[PDB]
Amino acid sequence: EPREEAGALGPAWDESQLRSYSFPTRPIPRLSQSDPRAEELIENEEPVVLTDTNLVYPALKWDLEYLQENIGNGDFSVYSASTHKFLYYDEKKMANFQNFKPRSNREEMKFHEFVEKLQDIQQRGGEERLYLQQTLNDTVGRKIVMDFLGFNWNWINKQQGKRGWGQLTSNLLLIGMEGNVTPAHYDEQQNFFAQIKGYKRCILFPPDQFECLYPYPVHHPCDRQSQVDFDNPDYERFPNFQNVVGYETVVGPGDVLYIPMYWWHHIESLLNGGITITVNFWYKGAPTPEYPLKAHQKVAIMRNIEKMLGEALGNPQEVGPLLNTMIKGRYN
C-alpha cells in the first residue's frame, strides 16, 4: 500500500512498479528511531526501517548534476549487465570453477563517462544496464566531504556502541538504473541501508530459510548467492523454495533499512522509477561469546565444514563427492 508524499505530490509508487514473485511476504516494521520497538528489533537482529534518522540528510540533496560536479576526478567501479539481474562474483574464486560463464562486467571509469553511458541509453532506448558499487575514499571534492561530515555520526556511532558491534568496515555508494535487480544473497556483516534518491524494494529472508534458498557452494565464485532464479524458479531442483516466506519493504529518500547479519536480501530499483542512490554502512558484528544454537550459527558452521574439506582434500571439486559419500544410506 503505497505511501502518500507531503503536499499531495501523489502516491510514492504503485504495485505495477514492483516485480511479481511466487512467494508471499510480510511487511518490515517502519519505525521512528526514538521508538523503543525499533531498538528491540535492532538488538534482536530483526530488520526495521527507521524513517527519521537524518543519517544521510545532507545527501538528500544529491542528484546526477550535483554529483558529476563535486565528486572529484577519482576512479569509480562501474558494473555492467546483460539483463535486469546483476549477478556479482568473487574474482579470487574463478580458478576453483573452470567453466564459469560471467554475466556481469566491472569497468573502471570517471563519473562523467558513466553519466554519458547512462544518458545515451536514456536517449537511444537500449536494453543494457549499469550499477555503480564504489566504496567511499579520500578522492572526493570539498563539498562532498562537507556532506559526508554532515551525516548523523552521533546516531550511527551510538548504535554501534550499544550493540557491541565492531568497527565500521566500509561505505558503499550506489547508483543504478530503473528496473535493476540485485539477487538474493547474504552478508556476514550488520548493515544500514540508507536511501537517498529513488525508491527501492527490499525483500528479506531470515537465516533459517537457508534450506529454501539454496546458496551456491562456498567455493563457487557466486558464494553467498542463491541459485534459484526468482523470475523462473525450478521446483524440481529447488523444491523447498515452495516454502519460502519473505519480509518486504519499499525504501525511499531518508528511510534507513537495518539488514541484520546473515539475512538474505533481494533488491529492486522500481520500474519506471528513475535512477537510484543509496549509501550503506557495514559493521563487523559483535564477536561470539549457548544452546539452543541460533540459525546464523548453524550457517557459520556449514561454511566452515565446507572450507576445511577444501584444504584437507586439496581440491574444492571433491567437497561434494565427499559429502555425498558421507550421507548416502548413512544420514538420509
Residue 312 partner contact from a copy of itself, Fe ion, ligand HQY, none using kind-dependent CB cut-offs of 5 to 8 Å: a copy of itself
CB of residue 235 vs a copy of itself: minimum separation in angstroms? 11
**70 annotated as belonging to a binding site for a ligand:** no
**169 annotated as belonging to a binding site for a ligand:** yes
Q: Reading across the β-sheet that carries 264-269, which strands appear in turn? A: 25-27, 246-251, 200-205, 264-269, 181-186
| Range 223-282, binding a copy of itself (CB under 8 A) | 227, 237-240
What residues form DSSP beta bridges with 185?
225, 265
Cell 530499483 sits at which residue?
269
* Contact partners, residue 289, CB within 8 Å, separation at least 6: none
Binding-site member from 49, 173, 277, 319 for a copy of itself (CB under 8 A): 319
Neighbours of 36 (CB within 10 A): 8
x/- track of binding to a copy of itself for residues 299-318 (CB under 8 A): --xx--xx-xx--xxxx---
**191 annotated as belonging to a binding site for a ligand:** yes
Specify the 3-state DSSP secondary structure of 184.
strand
Phi, psi of 225 (to 5 degrees): -95, 170
* Contact partners, residue 277, CB within 8 Å, separation at least 6: 59, 62, 173, 174, 175, 196, 197, 198
Please, which residue, 63 or 211, has the CB nearer to a copy of itself? Answer: 211
CB of residue 281 vs ligand HQY: minimum separation in angstroms? 11
Q: With CB under 8 A, what is the number of residues at the site for a copy of itself?
A: 37
Please, which residue, 60 or 172, has the CB nearer to ligand HQY? Answer: 172
Give the separation between CA 114 and CA 303, rounded to whole angstroms: 37
Residue 301 partner contact from Fe ion, a copy of itself, ligand HQY, none using kind-dependent CB cut-offs of 5 to 8 Å: a copy of itself
**162: left (phi > 0), else alpha (psi -120 to 50), else beta?**
alpha
Q: Is 188 exposed, middle or buried (0-12, 13-18, 19+ CB in 10 A)?
A: middle
Phi, psi of 240 (to 5 degrees): -75, -5
x/- track of binding to ligand HQY for residues 157-186 (CB under 6 A): ---------------x-x-------x----
x/- track of binding to a copy of itself for residues 195-214 (CB under 8 A): ---------------xx--x
Binding site for a copy of itself (CB under 8 A): 210-211, 214-217, 227, 237-240, 291, 293, 298, 301-302, 305-306, 308-309, 312-315, 319-320, 322-332
Binding residues for 2-oxoglutarate, as ranges, are 131, 182, 191, 200, 280
Binding residues for Fe cation, as ranges, are 185, 187, 265
